[PDB]
Amino acid sequence: KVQIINKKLDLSNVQSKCGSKDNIKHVPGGGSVQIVYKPVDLSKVTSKCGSLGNI
Amino acid sequence: KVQIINKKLDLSNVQSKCGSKDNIKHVPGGGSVQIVYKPVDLSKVTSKCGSLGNI
Amino acid sequence: KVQIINKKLDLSNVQSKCGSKDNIKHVPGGGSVQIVYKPVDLSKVTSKCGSLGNI
Amino acid sequence: KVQIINKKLDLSNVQSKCGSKDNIKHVPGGGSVQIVYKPVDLSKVTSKCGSLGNI
Amino acid sequence: KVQIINKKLDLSNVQSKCGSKDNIKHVPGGGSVQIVYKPVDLSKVTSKCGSLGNI
Amino acid sequence: KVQIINKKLDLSNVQSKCGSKDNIKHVPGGGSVQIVYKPVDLSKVTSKCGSLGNI
């Protein structure tokens, strides 16, 4: 009842200086094929909570 | 009842200076194929909480 | 009831200076094929909680 | 009497499908720095001379 | 009397499918630094001369 | 009377599928530093002269 066919795919990602700093859930997918069936996301993220960078 | 077929795939990732620092759940997938069936994400992330970088 | 077929795959990853520092759950998969069936993620990450970098 | 100084250069060339076919004197120099002092070019090129592609 | 100084250079070339076929004097120099002093070119090229591809 | 100084060079070339077929004087130099002093080129190339590919 679920049929997924990929035939004759030519995929490329080309990057020079694409650095990643201080991220949560960074998912770079340039030039990709992605097939997602019935996903559920109930995630909780709390990044920068409290007293930060004060003087 | 779930049928996934990949036939004749030409996939490439080319990177020079794509560094990763201080990340949580960093998942670079450039030029990839990804097939995800009924995923459930109930994750908890708390990165930078309390007292940080204060003077 | 699950059938997964990969035929004639030409997969490449080329990287020069793609370094990794201080990451949690860093999963590089450039130019890859990944097939994931009914994944459940219940993870907890707490990285930098408390008193850090204060003066 | 000739002084050439290059200081703090950040040069990049990034290309995906830039193929080269049937050329004479093809000199791609994207993102380059090039300094040429008193050049002389007396070259001769004859590419496609005579009887070609006739029916 | 000729002084050439290169200091602090960050040079990159990143390419995926940049193929070369049937070329004469193909000189790809992407992201390069090139310093050429008093060059003389007296080259002769004759590529495809005579009777070619006729029916 | 000629002084050439290279200091702190970070040079990179990254290539996946950059193939070479049937070329004459193919000189790839991506991300390179090249310093050429008083070059003289007297080359002769004759590649495909005569009777070729006729029917």
Side-chain angles (χ1 to χ4, degrees), chain A residues 10 12 14-17, chain E residues 10 12 14-17:
Chain A
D10 174 13
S12 62
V14 193
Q15 278 168 327
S16 66
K17 284 183 166 192
Chain E
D10 176 11
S12 60
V14 193
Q15 277 168 329
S16 67
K17 284 183 166 193

Side-chain angles (χ1 to χ4, degrees), chain A:
Chain A
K1 70 177 62 179
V2 180
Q3 180 179 131
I4 297 156
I5 299 182
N6 299 306
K7 193 187 301 186
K8 293 165 176 273
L9 306 191
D10 174 13
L11 309 194
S12 62
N13 178 63
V14 193
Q15 278 168 327
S16 66
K17 284 183 166 192
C18 298
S20 302
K21 183 179 176 183
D22 194 27
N23 306 282
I24 302 173
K25 286 173 160 280
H26 178 42
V27 189
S32 70
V33 174
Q34 56 194 265
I35 310 299
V36 190
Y37 182 90
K38 293 187 180 186
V40 181
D41 184 359
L42 313 188
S43 301
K44 185 170 179 175
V45 179
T46 74
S47 64
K48 281 176 181 176
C49 300
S51 178
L52 322 177
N54 299 302
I55 308 178

Side-chain angles (χ1 to χ4, degrees), chain C residues 19 23 27 32-33 37 40 43 49 51 54-55:
Chain C
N23 307 283
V27 190
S32 72
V33 176
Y37 183 91
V40 181
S43 300
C49 299
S51 179
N54 301 301
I55 307 177

Side-chain angles (χ1 to χ4, degrees), chain F residues 23-48:
Chain F
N23 308 284
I24 300 175
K25 291 176 167 284
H26 176 42
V27 187
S32 71
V33 176
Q34 55 193 265
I35 313 301
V36 192
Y37 183 90
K38 293 187 179 188
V40 181
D41 188 359
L42 311 187
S43 300
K44 182 174 174 178
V45 177
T46 73
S47 68
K48 283 177 180 175

